[PDB]
């Protein structure tokens, strides 16, 4: 159930000059790397103890890569401005997401390589790793350029071999925290609303991994439409938080049951107020 993902953010500034280049790298929901072009001497930064044991020479190589990407996204943003017949005036965004989902053995389950320009899909590597999906006419230019260059075939070697070898090294290096599941700490809170209503709130706290879903059931029936759900939030210690809420009649609370499914939970929990 493990994946390595890399997230790149390139933001142009009005007129000319260097764009803003941000690179984040994650192993599931645990970040191990940051790069920020906004530094007079930019460097690769380790965000997890398991990559800190990795050689200082490995740390120069990561920096050179992101320094190559930052230099490359300036020309990418420049080209797209021309694909969209846009001026140097005004800030634009170019995002790339690439990475690997680990299979049941030490094989690639799925490979990703996709782009967004101003937060609209641009081009995506298809599941076969041989093909691309262009969203507009502009992206079809990148696509015809990419199909001629055989970019997909070239990018295949990294997703399949390299991305996998590294996720595996990181999973062995961080086996203590990366390879374990921390179950949520469940409880229910009751909050009267009126003479005829009351909010029933099911909290899930201190869990790892993220968004491993809660539910409210009225007499065995899942409340898929009446459930007030908050987005899964980082606690800030590597753990996550989420709650599920439901407004219920005055004295009917007993019909409502909260369900929790988590890989750290050997059995789906049922709880009431």
């Amino acid at each position: 159930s493990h994946s390595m993902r890399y997230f790149y953010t390139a933001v142009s500034r009005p007129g000319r000059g260097e764009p803003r280049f941000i690179a984040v790298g994650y192993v599931d929901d645990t970040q191990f790397v940051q790069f920020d072009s906004d530094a007079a001497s930019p460097r690769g930064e380790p965000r997890a103890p398991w990559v800190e044991q990795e050689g200082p020479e490995y740390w120069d190589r990561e920096t050179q890569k992101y320094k190559r990407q930052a230099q490359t996204d300036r020309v990418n943003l420049r080209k797209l401005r021309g694909y969209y017949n846009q001026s140097e005036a005004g800030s634009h965004t170019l995002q790339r997401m690439y990475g690997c989902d680990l299979g049941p053995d030490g094989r690639l389950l799925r490979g990703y390589n996709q782009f967004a320009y101003d937060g609209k899909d641009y081009i995506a590597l298809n599941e076969d790793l041989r093909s691309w999906t262009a969203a507009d006419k502009a992206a079809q230019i990148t696509q015809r350029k990419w199909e001629a260059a055989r970019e997909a075939e070239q990018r295949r070697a990294y997703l399949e071999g390299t991305c996998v070898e590294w996720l595996r090294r990181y999973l062995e290096n961080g086996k203590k925290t990366l390879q374990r599941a921390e179950h949520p700490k469940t409880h229910v809170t009751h909050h009267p609303v009126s003479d005829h209503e009351a909010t029933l709130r099911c909290w899930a706290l201190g869990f790892y991994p993220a968004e491993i879903t809660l539910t409210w059931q009225r007499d065995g029936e899942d409340q898929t439409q009446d459930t007030e759900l908050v987005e899964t939030r980082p606690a800030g210690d590597g753990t996550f938080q989420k709650w599920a809420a439901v407004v219920v009649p005055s004295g009917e609370e007993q019909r409502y049951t909260c369900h929790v499914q988590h890989e750290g939970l050997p059995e789906p929990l049922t709880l009431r107020w």
């Binding site: 890399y6 690179a23 790298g25 490995y58 190589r61 990561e62 890569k65 992101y66 190559r68 990407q69 230099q71 490359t72 996204d73 020309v75 990418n76 080209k79 797209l80 790339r96 690439y98 390589n113 782009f115 641009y122 081009i123 990148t142 350029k145 990419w146 970019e151 990018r155 990294y158 390299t162 991305c163 590294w166």
Partner: peptide, 9 residues
């Protein structure tokens, strides 16, 4: 480890 050669579109 990041992908070595950058993607030019």
């Amino acid at each position: 480890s990041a992908e070595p050669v950058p993607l030019q579109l």
